[PDB]
Amino acid sequence: SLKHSVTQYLEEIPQQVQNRLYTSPATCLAIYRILPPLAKFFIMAMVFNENEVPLLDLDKWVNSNGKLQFQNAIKSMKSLHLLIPNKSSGTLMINLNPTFKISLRNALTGGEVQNSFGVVVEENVVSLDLLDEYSANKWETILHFMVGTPLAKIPSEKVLNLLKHSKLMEEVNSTGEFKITNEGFQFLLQEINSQLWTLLLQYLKMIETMDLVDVLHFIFMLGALEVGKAYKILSETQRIMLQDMRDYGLVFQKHSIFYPTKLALMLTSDTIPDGSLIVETNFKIYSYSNSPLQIAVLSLFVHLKARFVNMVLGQITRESIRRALTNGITADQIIAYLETHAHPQMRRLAEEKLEKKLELDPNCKEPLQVLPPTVVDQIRLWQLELDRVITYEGSLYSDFETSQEYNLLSKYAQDIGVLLWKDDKKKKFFISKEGNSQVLDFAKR
Amino acid sequence: IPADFVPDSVSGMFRSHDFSYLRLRPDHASRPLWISPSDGRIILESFSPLAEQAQDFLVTIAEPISRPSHIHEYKITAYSLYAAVSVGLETDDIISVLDRLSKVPVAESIINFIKGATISYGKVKLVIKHNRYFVETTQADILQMLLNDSVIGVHSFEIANESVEVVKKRCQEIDYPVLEEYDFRNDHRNPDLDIDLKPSTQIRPYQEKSLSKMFGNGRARSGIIVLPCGAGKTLVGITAACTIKKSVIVLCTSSVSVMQWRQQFLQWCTLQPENCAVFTSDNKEMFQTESGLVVSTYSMVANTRNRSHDSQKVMDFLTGREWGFIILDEVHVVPAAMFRRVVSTIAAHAKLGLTATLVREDDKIGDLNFLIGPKLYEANWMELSQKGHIANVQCAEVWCPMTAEFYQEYLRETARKRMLLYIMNPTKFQACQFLIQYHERRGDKIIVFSDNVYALQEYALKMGKPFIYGSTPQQERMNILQNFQYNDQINTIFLSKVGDTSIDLPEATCLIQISSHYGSRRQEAQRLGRILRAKRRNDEGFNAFFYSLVSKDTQEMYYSTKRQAFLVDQGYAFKVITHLHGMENIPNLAYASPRERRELLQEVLLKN
Amino acid sequence: STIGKTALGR
Amino acid sequence: ASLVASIVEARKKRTAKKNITPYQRGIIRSLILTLDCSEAMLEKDLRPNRHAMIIQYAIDFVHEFFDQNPISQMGIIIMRNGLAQLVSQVSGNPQDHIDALKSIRKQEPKGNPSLQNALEMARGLLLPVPAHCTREVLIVFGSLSTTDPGDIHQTIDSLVSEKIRVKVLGLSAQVAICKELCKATNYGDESFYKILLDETHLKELFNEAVTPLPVNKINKGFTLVKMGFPTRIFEDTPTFCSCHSKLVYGGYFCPNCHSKVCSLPTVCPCCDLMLILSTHLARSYHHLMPLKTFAEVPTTEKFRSEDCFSCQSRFPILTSSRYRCEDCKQEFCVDCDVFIHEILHNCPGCESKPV
Amino acid sequence: ESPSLLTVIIEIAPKLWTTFDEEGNEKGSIIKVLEALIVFLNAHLAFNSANKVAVIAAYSQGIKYLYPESTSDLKIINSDMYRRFRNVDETLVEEIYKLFELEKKQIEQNSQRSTLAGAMSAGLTYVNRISKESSLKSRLLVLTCGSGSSKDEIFQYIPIMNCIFSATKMKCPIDVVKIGGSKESTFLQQTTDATNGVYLHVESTEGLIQYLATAMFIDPSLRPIIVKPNHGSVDFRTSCYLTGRVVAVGFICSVCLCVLSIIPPGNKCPACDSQFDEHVIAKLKRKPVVPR
Amino acid sequence: IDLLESCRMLHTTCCEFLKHFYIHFQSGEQKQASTVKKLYNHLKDCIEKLNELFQDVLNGDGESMSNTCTAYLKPVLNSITLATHKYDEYFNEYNN
DNA sequence: TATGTACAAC
DNA sequence: GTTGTACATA
Ligand SMILES: Nc1ncnc2c1ncn2[C@@H]1O[C@H](COP(=O)(O)OP(=O)(O)O)[C@@H](O)[C@H]1O
Ligand code: BEF
Ligand SMILES: [Mg+2]
Ligand SMILES: [Zn+2]
Ligand SMILES: [Zn+2]
Ligand SMILES: [Zn+2]
Ligand SMILES: [Zn+2]
Ligand SMILES: [Zn+2]
Fold first, then answer.
1. How far is the centre of ligand 1, averaged over its atoms, from the C-alpha of B161 (Å)?
2. How far is CA B498 from CA B273, B452, E13, in A?
3. Could you say which residues form the signal peptide (chain E)?
4. Is residue E238 in a domain?
């Protein structure tokens, strides 16, 4: 979803803006790395030659087996408008964008770049002691604040407004508190690369008059910069952007000089399992994780009992599951966490259990399940316990002079989807509070 | 906290249970054991090397809590430690093994607890001579510790036969836990009995392991052997009696179970019938041979007030002789208020206790320590299930929604009358009938249990099937059981609390529950045992069944989740069935129309 | 695992 | 001392690898794989069982055998119900043997073994083998007893007369007849009877047998073998193959009769002329000019460079973490030494050094 | 999909490129090749941010690792370019400057045998080190100049043929780019064909970037889906031992496996001093039988 | 299917004679000449059969399948004629 | 302490 | 068939 999410946004931006976005080679070098491997191969073939190559020639390069990948590569390249198709004399000639072409040539051949990659002050700082600690503490604060665990230093208003504006960490003044949402749980389960891009995409969507092109010229350029070195300061809009990014733990700037951090490089590309847990039929949990994050997220729907340096053991209980559902976490997500973070032993036993059921019949009687069915049934059964009684706010309509009138008003509510219950014998029906005004207005007319 | 130990930001979620202050050893990937430095709980990885080497050592020193598929969980307590030392074990061996198998270093708190629970074993020994109990000791120094004891009163002193239960319990508190060993090899005063296991016998591995923990040093150890229901505890007792080669007495908590001992006993060993005698309410003749066998029940041995002239002679016959071996079947009932007197009246050199479940509601379970001895061996239920020794079971818990007509009275009525009200709900009748029909078409033998006699008879008459309960005579119930085993027409039978334990039905393969005792977890395990010995327990794809019909939104659900707290520990998984497929298409169902349902409500409320 | 089915009655 | 213990163990292991003389080895081989499928193979000493593990390693051995000995032949025999059952004829196709082994994996082993029956069958399969090929039998024995219909001693004498060689891999302990069979057949050497002590040792034993067996000095079979190097062709239309009589798009063309073949290296089905590629012969050059072992350089003397000559790895700063080649006198890291003598077969320093 | 390591093996020597310049009309063409290589390496670093670069130069008296620089700053290139690209390009040129000056010092030194086999062997060792250290692919590129008339390539057979098998074990395609008069190199061509590599021969140094970016830019992650632009067809044949002519059908000694187009003189092998039995060799000498 | 099976049938038998002819031709024993002559005659007949099959396909399928039929059996036919040509050349050298 | 149920005896 | 007594649980 990393390259898809960034790519998808770039397909929405008007082409008139994409052409201007390709002016800075720093952005093009990063945009070049997001395309599929086939796209990069074709782009590198067209960049160095100032000529038009027919689409048929490109098709010849790909083998019959890899024909499917060719359709995706061209579709993604054409959607970004990086590839300009023109037909002349019955030949579907294919060319490269001149702005993108020039930008790549300068980057590879080291031509004039107008400081797209920035400059270096030659005043390096220790990265392990400061950059790692600074971003790790800053990233930990936002993560812990999201998980809901108590923590002294709360995030600044900038990111806090971003969270509330987004589906992350729903907050209500009347309640006076904040809690995780359905999307919040998914965000916490996403890797660091995705955990950062989602916040940036929300920030880029919430930005209102810095300049859109300037924002991207900074985000992509940040990936170009290498961690552990100084960089002199840039656009007027980017200055406040740099300060804003300082609150997300991506850059360190004390009190004229800013320094990128591990997360800045993590944005561009990527970089037993930590987090794998065993769930028994006794509703117990034994997680092989040693980290404040993996433990904190488990506490959302688990009742932790003790901790060891190498593992944490807990117990699934009705109170814990109820505590998670009250915050809006769906049971379907809980099983996903337990399924996607299962220990190899559970998978091996399930495969052996499935293997003992594979040769017997083609149907196999079951798909592979890592964790015992009873845990799923109890978790889903508890969710039903929360929806035991259903209440709707609305009004009851009665005392109808004529049956036709009762059917007319009741049928109208059904048409607009605001009818919740009706009874022909009693000439009574109930409608949701949302549709009350419409029904009353229809009644008068 | 033997360090700076900076707490983690999430350490608050663990209230004084954070055990991160200690560090991990470099060989963690091999060592399978985690030890809790505070509560004594031990977590074992059953999927790692040295797991088998620890599954037996931990059982010896620690009582299991839960043993699911992958991760086991033991716990060290004074009771469990007492058992290990009694069989013979020093703190050095336990510490060496525990440290060698622990991913983390053994904390001082656990070391102190184990060291504190150390005994000078073998100093005091209780012996029997001509029905006289002498507390003999191997050194004279012990005399200053015993003769000067407040409670009491190559050196020995006399003690009253009935007062043995006082000295033994006192011996538990003065740091000298007495041991009851028997040198049957060197015992010539008692007339020997020549009985041996016939060549056709084949002792299973776990049976040999259980006996080795008893006769490991050559002297018959007095203790308790715990094996899953249907594991063959009867043959374990037979082998123990056969190897001891002395007069033996057996006590079992029924008359049907007494008979099945005699049948199995005459089968597995060569003890001729002339040397066997059964002491029950039907017949009371005793063997005239020099050394023989007596198989009886607690109810016939524990009565004190009034005994019949024919049964008083038998009791004198039992008491007069100095028996050489006593086997207590279902030993979870011996520490009762009166049943424990069977241990003081009938003199016996070696006492063996056989039971599948070693739990009970009250705290008297620990009384077994000073009555018959410690716990010698315990076997995992799942281990024997995967080896084909006992049948696998797919347990289930069916939720039968109570109808509005009956549920409206379930609220107003009192507690003592609620039980009979949610046991006879019409939906349960439909569920039971459908399941019985489905399994009967499957060629299965079904057993139905009901702690309520009124419900049992009502169900039996409605379905026209036989039932057994307290008032049933011995001959009738024995005939019913035999027919249910061999008769093709009799596919299913209704049982009650009488057959809840110690009845052998190899043909049974399915079990259904419509009623149950209030909250006893032991009864659930014992009932499940009836089907764990199914004959066709090895054919491919076989799966026995155990249904528990309960009433939705009733106090029975409170007990059902509490009545299966022991099976879950052993590893059994209970699933919830909210609907029975193909149940509506059945032609006829009981109380299908409102008229019949209303009639039942008026009929049941009359008794209320 | 049948959890979303109708009531067991009849 | 823990780190020192590992180094001395490595030095001891290197001791056996220090004496590398260019022994004359028979590159062209003819192997017969006798596997045991009897009641004794139903034990659980090797998880899951002896039969399963042996077959699995046999498949891996087949893959390795043909990869390093492309111009050799192999056959497979199984001992079942006191009789020898043939499951694969002597052939150079690695896929046929693997297919036979997979089929055997299903049938349960039962009965008693018979070395004489298996050896007698091996004597027959190897009879139509040229005099320039080394006739070898690799028996994987698992039982402690042998039930035979005749005198095993007579068969052992017959094997020696036919210049056959036998390697026996036992499972439980030594057997007197197997020791005599391997000793009287290998010119008195007693190193050809190996008993595994665990699963890991078993993998090494099969892997060791892949290498060619050095020949004896008094056993001379020198000769010239008529070989052929075909040229691959690319045809537009499918054509019938001369070996399987099926339609294949490609295939090599024999230089003696122009008949086409599907895969190499195989003997031409028309002129009975062996067809091979230059690569097939190059695979065995390292068995005729083995690379001289590298000797640990003492820390007393001074070193040339701080980094490896081949991989440019900083030498970790007691013991010198450098290995030098006498021919070129260039230091090497510990990692390179393993890769230069196992995967590669040429010293980069020697090639780089001009002459 | 995944990062891929690129290991370039450039064969630079005064005797090779000087002949290339004299034969043609291009002076200083080595500069053109060096600039093309610098651009090519930068392009590889642009395909992904997790792929490394390695350059090994085979000079007249040995080999030298141009990049990465040994642990043991004139401005050839402008500093305006990307930091990562500059960090590699600048080091490469500086090592080039050092090596050529060293070569100029030993110009009078006698070097008769090329050092291409050693460089390829060293590159394979580097590939293993990267693979074992730190899930990374690999690719070898041999940029050799064949214009210079080689003395004898026979000694390059045994080493090069050994690299083929090693390269096939680590899934490391080796591509070869040859700049010289000879159209085909029977040893290099076999190396590319048997290792899923690409062999390309170019006569003109100018426009080399187009060839490099269009032919040798295929990463290991997408080899199965791109058809190689290789045009030449190899025969996988070897020359005789005492005649030097390719043999389609001949005789090989069973002891040393040395090819012989004809029966060796003296009825004795010329490579291992092994005497062939007179009767057995006479069998080969027999002629076809036709009815009288 | 019928034509394809016949082609394989003809191909299999033609190669069998080719194998036998080469075995008896490269044996080096003079006595084998008599057998070689018989095998040589069989090869000549095989050529006629292959040509006849092509004619049968040519006039049966109207050249639609003859081109494919010849291609499927082109290598085998080429091998047979080469074997006969080698026999004739050596026969001319030896006898003539 | 009360209440079911099962058991032995008269 | 009934009365005096245990055991197992609220
Ligand atoms: N070794 C054995 N051989 C044959 N049958 C056995 C063996 N051990 C136990 N059984 C059978 O197991 C069943 C249950 O035995 P039993 O001793 O009544 O079990 P438990 O008392 O442990 O519930 C009986 O059918 C018995 O014959
Ligand atoms: F443990 Be058994 F059912 F007597
Ligand atoms: Mg029993
Ligand atoms: Zn073929
Ligand atoms: Zn041929
Ligand atoms: Zn190295
Ligand atoms: Zn060397
Ligand atoms: Zn030779």
1. 35
2. 28, 11, 102
3. none
4. no
Residue E179: strand, helix, or coil: strand
- Assess E42–A contact: CB distance below 8 Å, yes or no: yes
Do B and A touch, 3+ Cβ pairs within 8 Å? The answer is yes
- Asked whether residue E20 is domain-assigned, the answer is yes
Among the listed residues A252, A230, A251, A259, the one whose alpha carbon sits nearest the alpha carbon of residue A121: A230
Pocket test for ligand 2, best of B235, B502, B527, B566 (most atoms within 8 A of CB): B502
Per-residue b or e along D232-245, where b marks 16 or more CB atoms closer than 10 Å to that residue's CB: eeeeeeebbbbbeb
Closest Cα to residue E214, out of A44, A55, A40, A74?
A44
For B376, the enclosing helix (H) or strand (E) is: strand B375-378
B231 known ligand binder: yes
Phi, psi at E46, each rounded to 5°: -90, -25
Q: Is the CB of residue B61 less than 8 Å from the CB of residue B374?
A: no
B 273-292 residues, CB < 7 A, strand G: 280-281
Distance of CA D115 to the CA centre of its chain: 22
Q: Going along A216-283, which residue ranges are E strands?
A: 231-232, 251-253, 257-260, 277-279
CB under 8 Å to E148, separation ≥6 — which residues? E13, E15, E16, E17, E18, E19, E20, E180
- Are F12 and F4 in contact by the 8 Å Cβ rule? The answer is no
Domain at E24, CATH number: 3.40.50.410
Determine the distance separating the centroid of ligand 8 and the alpha carbon of D350, expressed in angstroms.
24
How many other C-beta atoms lie within 10 A of the C-beta of residue B520? 20
Number of domains in chain E: 1
**Antiparallel, parallel or unpaired: β E174-179 and E199-202:** parallel
**Rounded Cα–Cα distance for residues B402 and A441 (Å):** 44
Within 10 angstroms of residue B518's Cβ, the number of other Cβ atoms is: 12
Distance in Å from G1's C1' to B474's CA comes to 33
- Elucidation technique: cryo-EM
In a domain, E283, yes or no: no
Q: Which residues contact D123 (CB under 8 A, 6 or more apart)?
A: D155, D158, D159, D162, D164
**CA-CA distance, A261 to A251, in Å (whole number)?**
6
End-to-end CA separation in angstroms for chain D? 44
CB distance B38 to B104 below 8 Å? no
- Mark D32-49 as b/e (b = at least 16 C-beta within 10 Å): bbbbbbbebbeeeebeee
Check whether residue B361 has its CB closer than 7 Å to nucleic acid strand H.
Answer: yes
Residue B380 backbone phi and psi in degrees, to 5: -70, 135
Contact partners for chain F, using 3 or more CB pairs closer than 8 A, are: D, E
Question: What's the CA–C1' distance between B452 and H7, in Å?
Answer: 16
Q: Which residues constitute the domain of residue E17?
A: 4-216
Choose the closest CB to A63 out of E48, E80, E225: E225
Rounded to the nearest angstrom, the distance between the alpha carbon of E257 and the centre of ligand 8 is 6
Looking at CA atoms only, how far is residue A409 from chain B in angstroms? 33
Task: Answer whether B505's CB lies under 8 Å from B532's CB.
Answer: no
Q: Phi and psi at residue B556, in whole multiples of 5°?
A: -65, -35
Query: Cβ of E274 under 8 Å from any chain D Cβ?
Result: yes
Peptide bond into D214 cis (omega under 30): no
Q: Do E292 and F94 touch (CB under 8 A)?
A: yes
- What is the C-alpha separation between A131 and A229, in angstroms, rounded? 10
Give which of A380, C2, C8 is closest to B401, Cα–Cα.
Answer: C8
Taking the CA atoms of residue F2, residue F8, residue F9 and residue F10 in that order, the dihedral angle to the nearest 10 degrees is: 110
- State yes or no: B228 annotated in a binding site: yes
Q: Is the CB of B523 under 7 A from strand G?
A: no
Residues 107-146 of A with CB under 8 A from E: 107-113, 115, 117, 120
